[PDB]
Design a protein around this nucleic acid. Sequence first.
RNA 1: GUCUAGAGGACAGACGGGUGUGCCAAUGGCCACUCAGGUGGCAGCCCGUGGCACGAGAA
Length: 1011
Amino acid sequence: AVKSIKVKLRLDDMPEIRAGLWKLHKEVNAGVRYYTEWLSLLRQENLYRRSPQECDKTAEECKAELLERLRARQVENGHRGPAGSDDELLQLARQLYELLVPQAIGAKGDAQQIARKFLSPLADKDAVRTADVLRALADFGLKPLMRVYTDSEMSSVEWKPLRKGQAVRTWDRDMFQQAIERMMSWESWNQRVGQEYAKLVEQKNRFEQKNFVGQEHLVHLVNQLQQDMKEATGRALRGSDKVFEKWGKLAPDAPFDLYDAEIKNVQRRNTRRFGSHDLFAKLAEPEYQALWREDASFLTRYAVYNSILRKLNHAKMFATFTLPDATAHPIWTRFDKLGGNLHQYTFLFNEFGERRHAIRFHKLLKVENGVAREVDDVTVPISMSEQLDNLLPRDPNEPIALYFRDYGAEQHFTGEFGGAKIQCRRDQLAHMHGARDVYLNVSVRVQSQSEARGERRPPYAAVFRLVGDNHRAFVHFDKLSDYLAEHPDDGKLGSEGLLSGLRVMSVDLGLRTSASISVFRVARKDELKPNSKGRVPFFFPIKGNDNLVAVHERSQLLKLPGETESKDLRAIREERQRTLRQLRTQLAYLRLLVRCGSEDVGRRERSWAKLIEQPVDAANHMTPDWREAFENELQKLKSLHGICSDKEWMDAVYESVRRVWRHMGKQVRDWRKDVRSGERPKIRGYAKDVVGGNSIEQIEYLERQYKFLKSWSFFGKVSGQVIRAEKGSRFAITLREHIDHAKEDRLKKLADRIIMEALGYVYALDERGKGKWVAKYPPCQLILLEELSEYQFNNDRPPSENNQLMQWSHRGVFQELINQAQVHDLLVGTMYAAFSSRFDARTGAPGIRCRRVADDLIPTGEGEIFVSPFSAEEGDFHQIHADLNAAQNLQQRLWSDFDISQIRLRCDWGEVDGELVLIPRLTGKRTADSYSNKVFYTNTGVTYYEREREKLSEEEAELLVEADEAREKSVVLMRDPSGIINRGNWTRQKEFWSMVNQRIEGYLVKQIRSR
RNA sequence: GUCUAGAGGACAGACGGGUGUGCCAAUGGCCACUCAGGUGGCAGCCCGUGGCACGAGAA
């Protein structure tokens, strides 16, 4: 529970110090640059890499450079020999590196310890299995090995004098330790990035091994195709099933025009979604063997290989090396909490007033009149912050003791100041050499109540395993009965009630509603379990106990402010984007006209034909003045179409395109000026319904702007007026920042949102006035997240649910959850979520979603409410909210010890007894436990029956398997627990879901009855 | 009214003081050099009916 509080030093009156701060900074960095340069040098090896990747130093260059330093060193401390063989001296240097960085050889080390131990023999003449290394070193005349930076030429600074036969000032220590700490990190980072590349190469190389199977020629053909295309695949190639089915009728040695026509046929059926015409058109020629000759699958299979192939192409072998620079690569001056050894500081409460604090620096430095000398005790004011107002001091006599305070949470925590770092914006750093803002980053160590009670881990972590970090969750089932009596039920409802009862909250993440949470309490069945106000509660059996069951307390929908829906609201939302929708629709055709330019042929005709007369330029969404202007240049192109020569035509477009490009620039310029600075209504206080943030829609909307501007500009460079070299600077530096902070702010609030609920505090507006957290319900020990991908499973969640934002959001929340959750001891756990939205809890049988993403009723589409068959086969249909039910599923999965082996099975054809069978993918038990030496067979080929007899790489399991799917090689089976859908047998996957559609699609369609 | 999870339920109806980081309709203004976008130089908002969060560090 280290929280970091950054504060701004009002280093305003004293510019004697401000320069000092800056001088410190530059100075520390030089120190670290010194040692760190020694260390990089200090391994006899190894090639050092720096991208502009090019390797800055070999190999020998490090070795040749190091010897000189050493031999120069031997000369500096008078040596009467021996001076080691160069070769053997090198070994010692290597041996020393490793002790200095244990991580280099995959071991462990503490920079605090290794700095404490090693500096004095290294940097000191002592006068005014490591010990082999040091004794060996002095034998060779290399003590001290390295200069001490502050007591040196390099430092332009007058420090406080050195006495008492100590050769190292405190700072020489901090700089050394930083230098080690840094290498230790770098060494483990370089090893990881180097490894990932090989696993990419090795895993990629599998796909080449299994899939292409001695048919090089096809591969070469596409290689040859791609270059044909770039001369003057991915998942563009959307209609290949259909385009390729139809072509089969057509003949090789046949006219192309017949081929082009089929592409046009599928474009209309499948528009919007179609692969580039050009890819297909290119396909049409005598090169159609790639489609033409089985496998047909090959391009679709290949497209994946190209996915992987790029990734290694875009992935790097070595972690690049840069030495710190004050300005380019800053590292920060570091301090220590009062006590402990090195430079220290003291937080002063209310030093200059109430709520006005300051920081006393034992050992700050200051420059006067261009002379930089050291100073002893300095206090610096500090801008008042809300964050500071939170913390408190427990004992004046022992400083560094603070009460860290949370209100609602009803806890008051205890703790201490850790050490600080002084740092500024990285934007300013180039500027500094001048009033540039400076902050102090101060760590804060906070003791959870469990940490305070002296408990090593809280009482209930005994009962819940977690794993993989990526915490997985499993319950210990014996221990629930034990546990509960020791900690039985209570009124206690705050942070207080943590010991008292056992509770789990399950949270599902979704775009419309940020979290849907489910709370279940564990109580004995056949006790008061029947006692319910009014109706009996809903529950789940637990695997361990026949008198223990999980009672559901409440299920809720947690929404960030932006979530609410309304007529007034929807209106405002569509206005916001109206211009942007138009501008993107305008550019699309502006980019189309360019296509008319060709040069390469075929492109010119296809592009030309579509634009002019079919159906027409789109009135529906364009901005009108453009609509006219386009129609103008549109007529103009037509008149001159037969008449003009190829140049007259090509150069007519260029000039024609300029005409519309320029007009847009005013629209763009106009619009950016409005969004960038304009009147808009901005809320005050708390407004229940608000317009965008913190929703995904709002975040999305800001991205979309950025990602348009990147294209408006990019267009100009490709075709149109501009040609310019691209400088390092990226787009929309202001916007990029905004967005990222929106995003930061989103998920931090999303944690606190989820985190408050577990503790069962609700935020009640009245008066609002003041709305304050008031505790409501007893707290929940454990929090259940769901798991993340890759990969995206067929028939679990629409893609609408899956986009970089959702993935990013998932990742962000988990992290902030485990981080936020720490202070008050809440476990954070995850549960496989696959088909947690597809099946019921607890029929529980497969379903579909309805009605909506007159007054509508019952229609079926993805989102937002689940419906399923019950008990069974009409029977009846059971209706449930969609994301509420995913959460409830998570709970069932916990309590019953779910493994996905229960529902799904990946397997491929092999023959065991002169019979073809599906033989499972055994990785990894429970699946292995259940299904080892079981084998599946069919008579139908749709429904399957079971007869008797180290790497998991899940991310890569589906990918190798989806292609196996493309051939007949692999089949997936899925099964209903309920026995409703197929009699409960394993059914091939695709049929299984259709049977599911037909089952509910049918009653619903039928219920309509008469016209 | 409909639906199950029985619940915050989902769906319909002038003076004085401050300015740690950001979000919430929340992406500063002006001029000059090479419609977007950089690069260089110059000079609002809250509090005494405004809300919300916040470990940071490195890439």
